[PDB]
Amino acid sequence: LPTAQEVQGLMARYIELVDVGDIEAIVQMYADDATVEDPFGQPPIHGREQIAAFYRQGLGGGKVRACLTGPVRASHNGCGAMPFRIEMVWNGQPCAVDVISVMRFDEHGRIQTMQAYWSEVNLSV
């Protein structure tokens, strides 16, 4: 498993990749048995193609930005949690969403699960 420090590095890297819209690099961070729940509360999606499709739909326009808004919290069992903000578009207007992502990494350093906590209470203009 990634150490606590390695989890911090991986999760920060994920945000960097989201910020530049590197779909294949994001997908390559995930395990082949990975799931994504985003927003948490919705059914998980499964596997690399579904995850690729999800990021294409979210980031495809190219004008999404993302940045950490606090330190990555990391455990000793390959998990971590991070606060960040996504900047995007709502029908021609700049909007932002505050998110916390919780990730578990597997013994090969790939993301096994991602859960993104947010709802409309975290969306702003």
What is the number of structural domains in the chain? Answer: 1
19/123 Cα distance (integer angstroms): 18
CATH number at residue 34: 3.10.450.50
Of 14, 22, 32, 98, catalytic: 14
Q: Which residues contact 80 (CB under 8 A, 6 or more apart)?
A: 4, 7, 8, 11, 72, 73, 74, 102, 103
Of 19, 30, 38, 117, catalytic: 38
105/4 Cα distance (integer angstroms): 11
Domain housing 89: 1-125
Which letter, b or e, does each residue of 22-50 get, where b requires 16 or more Cβ atoms within 10 Å of its Cβ? ebeebbebbbeebbbbbebeeeebeeeee
